[PDB]
Amino acid sequence: DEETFEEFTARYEKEFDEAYDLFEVQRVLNNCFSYDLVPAPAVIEKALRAARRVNDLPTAIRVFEALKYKVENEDQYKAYLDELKDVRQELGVPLKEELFPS
Amino acid sequence: GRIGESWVITEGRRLIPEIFQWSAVLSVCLGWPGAVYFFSKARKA
Amino acid sequence: AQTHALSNAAVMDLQSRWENMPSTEQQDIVSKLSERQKLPWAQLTEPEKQAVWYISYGEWGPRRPVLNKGDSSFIAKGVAAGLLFSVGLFAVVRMAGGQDAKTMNKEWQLKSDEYLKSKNANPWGGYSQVQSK
Amino acid sequence: ANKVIQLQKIFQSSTKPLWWRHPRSALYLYPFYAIFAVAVVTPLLYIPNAIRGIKAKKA
Amino acid sequence: MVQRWLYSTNAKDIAVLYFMLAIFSGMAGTAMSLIIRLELAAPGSQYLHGNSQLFNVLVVGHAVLMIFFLVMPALIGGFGNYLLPLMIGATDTAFPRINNIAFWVLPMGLVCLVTSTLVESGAGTGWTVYPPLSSIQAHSGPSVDLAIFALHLTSISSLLGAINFIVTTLNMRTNGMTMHKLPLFVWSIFITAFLLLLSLPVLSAGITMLLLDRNFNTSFFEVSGGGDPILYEHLFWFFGHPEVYILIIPGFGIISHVVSTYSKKPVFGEISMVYAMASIGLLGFLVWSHHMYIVGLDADTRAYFTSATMIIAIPTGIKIFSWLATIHGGSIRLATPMLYAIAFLFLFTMGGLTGVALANASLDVAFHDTYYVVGHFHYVLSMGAIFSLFAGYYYWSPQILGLNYNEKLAQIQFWLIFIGANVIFFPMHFLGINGMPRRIPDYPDAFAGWNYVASIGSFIATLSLFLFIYILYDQLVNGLNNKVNNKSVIYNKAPDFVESNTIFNLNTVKSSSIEFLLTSPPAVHSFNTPAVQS
Amino acid sequence: VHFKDGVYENIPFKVKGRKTPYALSHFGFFAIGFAVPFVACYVQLKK
Amino acid sequence: TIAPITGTIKRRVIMDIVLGFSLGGVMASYWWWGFHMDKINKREKFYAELAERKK
């Protein structure tokens, strides 16, 4: 059966809350982003929480880098990274483009 | 909703290069013997 | 957790020198960075963040691509060398061949065209067989 | 004659190849090897006369 | 080492022996093809001094060699006997002595084919061995008998390997494997084994009737006697079109695997792929008389056979579109098996569309025995079997040999055989549609231009083959070196775009098939405990 | 039965421990494979 | 907030499908209406001239 968008959101919130080490955080994020939809910002917020809980920085940068390669415009990336501004400020992860300035 | 430029714009800007590149690639892959006939003696040139 | 910071002598420009660092120094840097991970991530310096990102997702090892930066030109030059070498070999074994047919002449094929025009063969297409010199 | 149990013992208790494990194995195996060698040497030997044109003389 | 290779009874040693004999005979078939195309470069007897009999003999040698001694041993024998026990988790295939006698009955078929070529005149009858041309009144001498015995020995090999494959994949699956949970190459070689088992009887019947006409004065096919030569055409093509589907369907197995493993997403509707392969296999045996639209069949018979032949365009279209659906939306890692898969897709679609234009019995008036049909069949045979073979080799040879091959040389080899095969087989459609007949050593001199450009293409194809057998040498002497430097591709699947490199290194092979988690070169008897599956 | 296994024990020929070079046998195999039809053409043209 | 952005691949597939059918239809419309119609116009012109010289 096909999942609606909010059902997807609830399922990946529950999955990222239940993930317990780094293999599970990267697995949940891999098959989180391998659908035909950019995940809701609550799911990305739970992804950054779950990458913090397993004490691994660069996957929490890979959240935003995969969001950049996943989202369709250059403006929806701005809409995402300004709606995750306080979360990214609290955890303190950089974007990849402001980490490697070129 | 509909943040950003429309899907028409942001997929036409990907497709319009690819139409010309596909036409070039297939016109090489199918119309290569035209060059041999063109340089050939049976065109009387 | 760990001490103050990874030194710049041991972490700066980690992209240029990851693949030349010996495996022991790789393992020790990876261990100290994993100990630095548990601190609140504001306290990481910028070469540390670049080193951690290149260690996890840099274009080395398993993320090394199929063709590394000179291979596309080498395969283009290789297929061009193959085409030129093969038509050279065709010219050689063609030169060691039999004589041409006696009907492969311009003047023979003009008379063939003359006969076909007298019979008005191929009226809306082409009837001329010339093709040779 | 019901040699099945005795031949099970002989066949399982043997470090020989399976065609050699019976006590009567050489009695088949030596003339078969000689006859096989002759029968695969000779028609290969008649190939030069086949590709040369020399048919067999009717004598 | 006498035991392990001569007295062999495990499937992998039989498989590498099958592959060695296949590639030896494929080198010989390519040489005969080069000589054919060399003689067909310019009109007039260029290299063979007259002697159209030798040209016809090389035509049947090239045809029977490339079909019955390269593609069928390679695809069926080597790839089946390596992966079919492996990809189902079987220990060693049931009846392994039948598996050994099939291989060892092949190269003596090669021996008697070569001696048919050497004896009094040679078989100059075409690869179809049509009477009364192949009868004793037109072909005296023992040559066509030895070609018939070559076909009989390779028929024994194909049938016995087909029996072996059927009961191996039916009886000896692992414990978790239902028939629905099988891979597509295993399903492909299963369906191919069934078509071999149901086709090779009619070939053996027609060929032994030909032999009985030739040497025992009987008349199955002699008109002076009441016999009818069209009976041989019916029998041989009831073998013959199932045979060409037998040759193509292992390619349909290999391409699913290399496409799914280099797009990093599973096959689109895999059970529909099983149904489409089985539908093609069932629909082969009903279309066999499209090869003889010329003999004077009834109009209702030809109107049937064009519809029956056209119906097979639908499942092959389902397969060719599900491959596009597998490649769509994935992450393409363009290694050389993926290059051979993409080139297979495009060039097999072109050959199939020329075949659809050939399916019509009103147009096969205009195209029968022209070079248009050799365009069609060299397209589907050459691309869909040689590109499938090269994709299977560059796909499974690092695993079954432990030695990685040079990748830059592999891509120049692919590109050279791509443009060379295109340059040789594209003007054949022009020569055919302008009316150049088939199996001629010489032509009217209006065909010389396209014959020249195709004969130019043949040297490109032979250069790509010489390069490939250099890649074999370089793989065999510097494989471990190729692993340790950056001259090859170690990992067929890159990390996904979230996956760390150490997280990858703990899980470095992510396949839906057994064969890639086996050790490089695998254990001589692996699967001690059976491979479990949910 | 238990044979040896490893990198070069999977194949009939002998590559590493070898008196002659491997390239000798590896290209002589494909060379006689490529030259079988030339033997055939020579015999048929001599006839 | 962010409205749910879903289904880019479906729109992309139907756009690629209709662009491929229209591209192939442009190829085939050129094939028929140029090449086949040109050959048929040459043949019909020859048979018109032939019937005229038969009058």
Ligand code: HEA
């Ligand atoms: C297996 C099918 C097959 C393949 C691949 C080929 C490939 C080639 N063939 Fe042929 N051919 C036939 C099957 C095939 N042919 C048949 C059935 C006939 C009918 C005879 C008749 O009608 O009477 C025929 C006849 C035929 C004709 C028609 C002649 C005529 O009747 O007038 C010509 C014309 O040029 C030709 C030449 C070639 C050439 C130059 C290639 C080139 O493509 C050669 C280049 C190919 C390679 C370089 C292959 C790679 C080599 C390998 C060894 C594979 C290695 C890979 C692994 C081992 C994994 N062959």
Ligand code: HEA
């Ligand atoms: C590789 C083996 C192979 C395969 C797969 C085929 C596939 C087909 N062949 Fe062919 N054929 C041969 C090997 C093969 N053939 C050989 C060796 C000969 C010569 C024998 C001799 O002369 O001795 C021959 C000759 C031959 C003849 C005899 C002509 C003659 O001798 O006068 C005919 C006639 O119907 C034919 C037709 C077809 C058709 C319709 C298919 C179809 O199965 C093709 C299916 C594929 C497609 C249709 C394309 C993919 C589909 C799509 C892209 C979807 C869209 C398509 C449509 C809507 C149509 N081919």
Ligand SMILES: CCCCCCCCCCCCCCCC(=O)OC[C@H](COP(=O)(O)OCCN)OC(=O)CCCCCCCCCCCCCCC
């Ligand atoms: C004669 C009739 C046939 C003509 C064929 C075309 C003519 C050209 C012949 C080949 C020239 C050699 C070029 C080498 C290119 C190279 O070097 O490739 C290097 C590229 C780029 O590499 P990169 O971006 O990673 O960076 C490298 C720089 N740092 O990677 C690739 O391989 C991808 C390109 C190949 C795509 C797959 C094609 C597979 C066969 C398709 C069959 C046809 C399908 C399409 C039909 C419409």
Ligand SMILES: CCCCCCCCCCCCCCCC(=O)OC[C@H](COP(=O)(O)OCCN)OC(=O)CCCCCCCCCCCCCCC
């Ligand atoms: C005749 C047309 C078809 C020809 C053959 C197809 C082309 C071959 C290549 C296919 C590549 C893509 C396949 C993978 C895509 C996929 O698998 O997508 C999967 C998605 C899933 O959707 P979901 O999540 O809503 O449902 C989940 C539960 N099913 O389904 C789709 O996208 C639907 C696409 C509909 C396509 C309609 C086509 C309309 C145009 C028809 C032709 C019109 C011509 C007009 C000319 C002027």
Ligand SMILES: CCCCCCCCCCCCCCCC(=O)OC[C@H](COP(=O)(O)OCCN)OC(=O)CCCCCCCCCCCCCCC
């Ligand atoms: C040919 C010249 C040989 C010279 C030998 C001189 C002997 C002096 C001592 C030298 C050392 C010993 C040499 C003997 C060892 C030897 O070389 O193996 C001997 C064998 C044959 O031997 P034979 O019976 O003809 O030899 C007569 C004397 N006994 O060769 C070969 O199989 C050559 C095989 C070519 C390589 C094929 C490459 C392709 C393989 C693909 C495999 C992967 C498959 C993957 C898909 C399933």
Ligand SMILES: [Ca+2]
């Ligand atoms: Ca000629």
Ligand SMILES: [Cu+2]
């Ligand atoms: Cu057919």
Ligand SMILES: [Mg+2]
């Ligand atoms: Mg015919």
